[PDB]
């Protein structure tokens, strides 16, 4: 398992719209991708200004660009999903959005 936010650098300008994909290599059938805002609230595909978009092994965040919109974290989790990556790392990725 390996988790990476495809636009590793979150650098946006006010009024712009951003797309941050979270891709998972080695996705296992028992795993699930979940995005989380800096506040800590679990984002869902309900299409507020900031929402998400699912795929079998990738979930695309869609951040607009308020100066107060800023660190978002993608997490891979599941009952039979591995708690460690191939590199004995934690199965999560982070992108720091800087407006």
């Amino acid at each position: 398992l390996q988790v990476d936010i495809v636009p590793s650098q979150g650098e946006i300008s006010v009024g712009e719209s951003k797309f941050f994909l979270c891709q998972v290599a080695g996705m296992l059938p028992t795993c699930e991708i979940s995005w989380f805002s800096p506040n800590g609230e679990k984002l869902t595909p309900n299409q507020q200004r900031i929402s998400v978009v699912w795929n079998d092994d990738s979930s695309t965040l869609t951040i607009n660009a308020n100066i107060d919109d800023a660190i978002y974290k993608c997490v891979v989790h599941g009952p039979q999903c591995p708690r460690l990556t191939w590199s004995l790392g934690l199965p999560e990725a982070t992108v720091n959005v800087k407006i």
Partner: protein, 277 residues
């Protein structure tokens, strides 16, 4: 010139194996911009397993999942439906019954191929461990082998004698080009001007029997643990065990012939730790 060339080819470990033995991390792999080091040895490492220090969970336990604690899991692939690992020899030959290039492979080679068949396309081909006791293939989700300094280390413990550590590159003809059996009444030597001469310089360790000698040779064998770290198979991979003096005479150059001596057994870091011929 040298009549032993063909017979001794399998003991040119740098050529036939080509990677670390104690710690095998001989190839690089790119996966979505991330660099990984993976075992790449072409030969099976008989009797090798992984000891997780200060735990009581075998390394063959599946990796921790869901709410399980990290230190309650091991290195093995996690459960799936259908279950991909561990898979028995018969289960494997049936699962690949329609693949002509796989169904009749050697059990070890079949385990290797199976472990490298978890992603269809994906360059991350897991290593594996084959247990001759249960005839079971265990895919290793964790390719790491040492972390001394959550701490673990490779070892040829007596309880691992039926385990065989397999990289993704284990060859189908290993039984012919790789070392397995130890050589009773034989002593590694270097061929020179028509005669098999003794190894001119060895490192002598005391060892009560062949098993401890082989375990020593393993501990001192080629290792890739931190190209600067890739051993490519160079190391103290060979040993002549004197059973009467109980001496493990270890050395690090490829042997090129055998000497007939009823007091000696020839072993390598790859060889089985007990079996002899």
């Amino acid at each position: 010139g040298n009549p032993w060339t063909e017979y001794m080819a399998k003991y040119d470990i740098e050529e036939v194996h080509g990677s670390g033995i104690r710690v095998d991390l001989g190839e690089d792999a790119e996966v979505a911009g991330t660099q990984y080091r993976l075992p790449s040895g072409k030969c099976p490492v008989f009797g090798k397993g992984i000891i997780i220090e200060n735990s009581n969970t075998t390394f063959l336990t599946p990796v921790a999942t869901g709410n399980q604690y990290l230190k309650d899991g091991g290195f093995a692939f996690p459960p799936t439906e259908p279950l991909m690992s561990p898979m028995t020899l018969d289960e494997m030959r049936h699962f690949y019954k329609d693949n002509k290039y796989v169904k009749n492979l050697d059990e070890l080679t079949l385990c290797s191929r199976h472990a490298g068949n978890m992603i269809p396309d994906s360059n991350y081909k897991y290593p594996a461990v084959y247990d001759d006791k249960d005839k079971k293939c265990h895919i290793l989700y964790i390719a790491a082998q040492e972390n001394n300094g959550f701490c673990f280390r490779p070892a040829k413990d007596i309880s691992f004698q039926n385990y065989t550590y397999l990289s993704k590159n284990v060859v189908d003809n290993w039984e012919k080009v790789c070392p397995r059996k130890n050589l009773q009444n034989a002593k590694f030597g270097l061929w020179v001007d028509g005669n098999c001469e003794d190894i001119p310089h060895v490192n002598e360790f005391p060892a009560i029997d062949l098993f401890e000698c082989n375990k020593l040779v393993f501990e001192l064998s080629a290792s890739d643990q931190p190209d600067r770290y890739k051993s490519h198979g160079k190391g103290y991979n060979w040993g002549n065990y004197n059973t009467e003096t109980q001496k493990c005479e270890i050395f690090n150059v490829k042997p090129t012939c055998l000497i007939n001596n009823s007091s000696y057994i020839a072993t390598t870091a790859l060889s089985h730790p007990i079996e002899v011929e």
